[PDB]
Design a binder for this molecule. Structure first.
Ligand code: ADP
Ligand code: ADP
Ligand code: ADP
Lengths: 375, 55, 375, 375
């Protein structure tokens, strides 16, 4: 429905796919990366009923569906489900025909090449796109934020990439790939809500807990002060309405879940924590780089929206940092959306028009071309 | 009623969001009040370092 | 009448309560976790007749009683009824007053905290026990089975816990708790027996179906091959004599009911089964742990009392496991009783003498102390 | 268990520790420079379990331990862990109390002096050694190799030192120190194995990649030719088996890891590589020295075990070198162990018996004495 062959932009995460067209400042819609399937035997005749539901269909009919995500910590492992998600995104909601538009996809720079090669392959081979580019999420948040330098901290649903960029350059020896994200925080919360008497196991229950976290949780500027207080008084509880009319109240679990980002040991992970990985990405860079990365701690993705996180991360790095150095977090409202936004900006740059893989180059070069043309 | 209640919920949603933003901003206000004052004090500690160094 | 001031041990599950003294062989008595109450109007007078019946009393007079279980899915919800079960257990069969004897009770680590707090509180406030401890059923299973390392698959009456333990340490993020247990297998059997022409709906009928399951059902090492014959010939049926002289038989339903453990969807549960949970608990553990857990899958609890289960599980995990690796199962004759057995072992260890909460510690701290000192 | 009060010899690097007695041919025990600590909460009672594990204990029980290396790029920063490594080495494996035997420790001359002062201090103040001598690894390398003159090429796990020696004298202005070593080569391998779909981040996983490197990696004489071949054919792929039965197949990563020694930009290092520095160490020496250093380029320490390394280094130095001149590399089987051997040789020389610091000269002078008595 577009009146120009603008590039399409789709940010495919473990959570939701943000999608819209290049040149806008937002996706048209967010398409949860979900393909649902009925888990019950039909009794009534003439009910329609499909073998699978996609995106918002999968969540709307979830009462009898088992819901699964095709993306594991940033890598697509279930390609059948992503073709359904992508098809639905273009076909029904973005009202897009990729055959007439270049498409820009996003990815962590640290993920296996198999994902960037396959995403390049599907847009050219299944959706017949005239051109492709797969972009780096550190880059995309920095474009959206108006920055060329900084440590980009995603703390997303899937992966935390911890990548320092200076003057537009990667500083790869200082990268901390971290296997800790919102999907793990959610599982932790289900176990501690079980301690409170509310057992969340099945899909409807998993989606409820993800909704509880998104509306009730925070990290706390100072964990121990909130911990001691929340564990001692009901004044720190917050309620949530369960869909059947029942309610749940949450106390110190409200922050114990988000806290895993700073304390990965909460879920059995061996990790420095997001504030130390951010710190180490600054620390491992050259001495004349360190000052610029300290002043540019850059947020990306979701969870960066938790109360106390922008103030806490700045304090946690300051506590590890040398004196003299001025430490600052860049936490724009373009939060949870900056990677998609960066894609819109990048796709549209005049300086990026030659970075696109064309269909002819793809067909001659093969799928490995993404390694030579994108990153 | 459902729509009005929905509005109450949407508006309460906004109310809570604004309240969270209010508190975030207010908490930032307070940390900034503390910083503006600590900074005014630093404006003086630094000015004093200049005066001392000048002497 | 005892020759030592030892601890008491009671495995109070959602099914039955195994009770005896620490340091002894087994439980002195096993009670149903049942409190029974009459549902009829009396006509004769001077007939005795209780307001409520407990344990074996509840079953012996069940012809006119409705039978309720105070414990469900691993948690006591009716503390008053458990106090009644315990008064009877301790004073009438064990012939002991807990006032002079430390008492060990059990739970799963993922049961709501209320379970451990009420177990501790009843014994300290209504029995005046000098000390308390709430134990981990998986730990007790490992002591009884001769292991410090393995996956404990307790397959109980109300819940399956599925927890990896390595060198005596928990790997808690890898616990795959499942909402499928022996009580659900009984209800499934009641529905399939109804399809066969034998409907059961009231308590007497429900207790009998559980008894039918316990004596007639098996799981089969290979359910497809078992079904090929069981569904084709009457030679695979087994008869059960009902209390009233009627005879009920079961054909391939005899193994299809237990099969739920490998097919939870049979009762409407969103799960692939116990072997999937066993496998994922191993998967969530570090690579240098996994080799020992594959070699040490531990069956404990009841419902493991189905012929073909040790072999069924070895095949089902081997099927998911990497090649080269040896997958092994521990399934001792001390099945269903192994938790009690472990209780006696733990309660009496010299290394466990300081793990006990004393009455003085309880009175000063209150019941929340169990959450901090036991585990 | 030793029949003489000979010197103890221990080469403690950032990777492995080689320990034995002077006058012998080989270390009696080899330990990793590792102290391990449990990162999990204990669940079972009476399980023993140590607070910390050392050397081979640390690796043997590693499934639930985080493993730390006390040495950072050649310098010991964690002396709590090193006194454990030394105590274990002496007390349990060499079966010696250092109080009865002199001890020789080793380090590069550009290693901060603080480390040789502390090595002298640990043996005198914790182990009460009667005497000390901190040796130059290059000195020990030339004794073990049968040389007095030559270039010592010693890239290790920590750093690369690169030092020319002529007639037993050092030419220190020609030392080319680089922050390029096996730990960084390993980090590069972890990133490129991630590119292939095998992401390794935890201690167990990091140890696996280090083990993959040691068993599978090589350099090849010609990098462009090996690269072009690996990119064209499966004939250069090699498999590795992992502890849980997983198998990884590795292609050009097998030599791209080692390649970093010639291409330091792979790990963010500002360097032209080890052949440029080996060449410069010869070049910075007087022309009447250079002829003997060119003909006696001597490998010691590990990484020298990569097939194709002796030939690539000889070829690159030859390409950089003037024509007519004969360039030769000595790469003896006593590789990775030759420094220990040199330690044994030096400690036992009659001409070296006056070089030992006694626990008297040390106590009167203090720790700084090592700078005047050793190097
Ligand atoms: N307000 C919030 N409170 C708590 N967590 C949040 C909030 N906003 C975003 N996050 C978390 O971040 C993730 C969604 O952010 P997003 O980066 O847009 O996902 P994606 O990478 O698919 O685009 C979810 O896991 C969500 O729980
Ligand atoms: N032969 C059998 N067939 C089927 N189920 C059995 C058999 N024997 C024991 N069980 C089951 O054991 C359960 C109670 O045992 P138990 O494992 O000790 O509970 P828990 O461990 O949680 O305290 C009951 O549901 C009972 O049906
Ligand atoms: N087969 C090999 N492949 C790659 N590197 C090797 C090999 N053998 C030895 N090295 C390296 O050398 C180390 C052992 O030799 P050494 O230099 O004496 O220890 P260090 O450098 O810590 O002082 C090992 O950690 C390994 O990283």
């Amino acid at each position: 429905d577009e009146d120009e062959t603008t590039a399409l932009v789709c940010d495919n995460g473990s959570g939701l796919v943000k999608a819209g067209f290049a040149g806008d400042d937002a996706p048209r819609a967010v398409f949860p990366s979900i393909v649902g399937r009925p888990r019950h035997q039909g009794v009534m005749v003439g009910m329609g009923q499909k073998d699978s539901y996609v995106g918002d269909e999968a969540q709307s009919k979830r009462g009898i569906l088992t819901l699964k995500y095709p993306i594991e910590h940033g890598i697509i492992t279930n390609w059948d489900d992503m073709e359904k998600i992508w098809h639905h995104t273009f076909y029904n909601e973005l009202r897009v025909a990729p055959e007439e538009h270049p498409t820009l996809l996003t990815e962590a720079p640290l993920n296996p090449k198999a994902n960037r090669e396959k995403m390049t392959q599907i847009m050219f081979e299944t959706f017949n796109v005239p051109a492709m580019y797969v972009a780096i999420q550190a880059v995309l948040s920095l474009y959206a934020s108006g920055r060329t330098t900084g440590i980009v901290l995603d703390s997303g649903d899937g992966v935390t990439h911890n990548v320092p960029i200076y003057e537009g350059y990667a500083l790869p020896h200082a990268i901390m790939r971290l296997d800790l994200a919102g999907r793990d925080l959610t599982d932790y919360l289900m176990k501690i809500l079980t301690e409170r008497g509310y057992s969340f196991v099945t899909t409807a229950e998993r989606e409820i807990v993800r909704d509880i976290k998104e509306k009730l949780c925070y990290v706390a500027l100072d964990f121990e002060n909130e911990m001691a207080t929340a564990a001692s008084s009901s004044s720190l509880e917050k309620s949530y309405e369960l869909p059947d009319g029942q309610v749940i109240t949450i106390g110190n679990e409200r922050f114990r879940c988000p806290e895993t980002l700073f304390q990965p040991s909460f879920i059995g992970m061996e990790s420095a924590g997001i504030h130390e990985t951010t710190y180490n990405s600054i620390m491992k860079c050259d001495i004349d780089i360190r000052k610029d990365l300290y002043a540019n701690n850059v947020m990306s993705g979701g969870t960066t929206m938790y109360p106390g996180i922008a103030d806490r991360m700045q304090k946690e790095i300051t506590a590890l940092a040398p004196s003299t150095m001025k430490i600052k977090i860049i936490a724009p409202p373009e939060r949870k959306y900056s990677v998609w936004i960066g894609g819109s900006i990048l796709a549209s740059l005049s300086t990026f028009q030659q970075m696109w893989i064309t269909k002819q180059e793809y067909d001659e070069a093969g799928p490995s071309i993404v390694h030579r043309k994108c990153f | 009623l459902e729509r009005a209640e929905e509005r109450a919920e949407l508006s309460e949603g906004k109310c809570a969001e604004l309240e969270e933003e209010l508190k975030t901003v207010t908490n930032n206000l307070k940390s900034l009040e503390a910083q503006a004052e600590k900074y005014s004090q630093k404006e003086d500690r630094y000015e004093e370092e200049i005066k001392v160094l000048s002497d």
